[model samples]
Target: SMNPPPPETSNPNKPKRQTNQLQYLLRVVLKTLWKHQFAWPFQQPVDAVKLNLPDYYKIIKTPMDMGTIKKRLENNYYWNAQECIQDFNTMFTNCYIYNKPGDDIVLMAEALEKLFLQKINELPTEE
Candidate 1:
């Protein structure tokens, strides 16, 4: 008779899959952005006309929508860097309107771009 299979033992030193690492990095970026005021800018000032100025209103005016990004990450293992870039560009488009982005906004975008690039680079190499 054949013997039963041995119980599986966990290995702490095992390397994490690229997908898991990417997900963790995305979560960190999302959480950091979540804490920032610029993440949600849908609430406009009472003087809506001023917000429509050609050169005065240069801030994000829409919610960052972290949920959407989370869903995308959850549903797809092969996340596309281009899609992430598009999302980031859309989020910061208003800041680019006046051709003058605040230091904080620029910094946030740069950090996110860096993280996205890191994740893209971490993708597994083909056999």
Candidate 2:
């Protein structure tokens, strides 16, 4: 038998995933776009393969589902830079313009800026 037993599980209903204020805010922002549908145009250019203007509008107006966004997130992890940029750009650009100025937006912007800085840091240093 183990000398020290595992800690007691008081509340089985408690969440397994760690609660991140930034991630929570990200989920809220993502859900906002998901609810709105992807009908809006990008503030900057994105890969043609990643987003076509017509399909984008249709997607926003229709199911407004999470499947596409989730897929993009996974794709980015696998070194798909275009999808990563597109996802980040789309979310950040929209939030920058339309998202109301408030605490929620501030948190979301902070999270986004953290990710943006990570990308910049990854670039090779100039000689």
Candidate 3:
């Protein structure tokens, strides 16, 4: 009789696929943009429209406020701080939904911008 080799252990340090995170973020931002499509639908006066998937996804998917992310950071406090900071920066700087800048678009933009600013302000200073 032969015994099966011990079950392979998962690589704890393996990098997580960011695709899932990106998709989730895209969905959130798309929903928000759709809800406020009246404002920023791309190209002034609406002759043509374009979807900036990457930018929109990043902004919408990331929690723009501190409260939501604070809890997550608390739970993962033991994790790498540099990576966390990079994640936050990437989400804010790279994500944007550019539209014609209409009423709804403006509203959505303002809301998201405010949240981003708030989050930045809330970052912990060097101890």
Candidate 4:
């Protein structure tokens, strides 16, 4: 009364078997990260004119934020969990490149990175 899973033949690196499970887990973890205080600065796009970092765009080619990630998730824009993770990491990467190393924003980005890594690692592997 059940279908057999496809052979794990060609999926050594990027397994597609759990992608459906992965999306749900990504949703839950994304919210958890957003709710954290460390995520405050990254909820929205950086205002270049307001923030006064005119060269921000010139340096960080692909800026990312939780707002965009959330929108993408709601609209099923991401094809896989890894793609979603790339965007989240991009948020931190842009922060690191644009902000001073001693700035609180950079510190928070580092903290959030660990939170994200742990959250992703903690995902359930079962259906």
Report, for every candidate in turn, its global Cα lDDT versus the true structure.
Answer: 0.44, 0.38, 0.37, 0.72
Off by over 4 Å in 1: 1-18, 42-67, 74-78, 98-127
Compose the digit string of candidate 4's lDDT tens values, residues 63-87.
7888777766655565467777888
lDDT of 3 by residue, 17-102 (tens): 33333333334432333344332432121111143244443234332322323333433322344444454443334233333455
Best by TM-score: 4
TM-score of 3: 0.29
The best candidate in terms of lDDT: 4
48-124 in candidate 1: lDDT tens per residue?
25434432322434423344554444445224444544554554554454335556646655555555456555644
Decoy 4 TM-score against native = 0.77
On the 0 to 100 scale, the lDDT of residue 28 in model 4 is 75
| Candidate 4 Cα misplacement greater than 4 A, ranges | 1-19
Candidate 3 Cα RMSD after full superposition onto the native fold (Å): 14.8
Q: Lowest-scoring 10 consecutive residues by lDDT in candidate 4?
A: 1-10
lDDT of 4 at 54: 76
The residue-level lDDT of candidate 1 at 105 comes to 47
Which residue pairs show backbone clashes in model 4? none
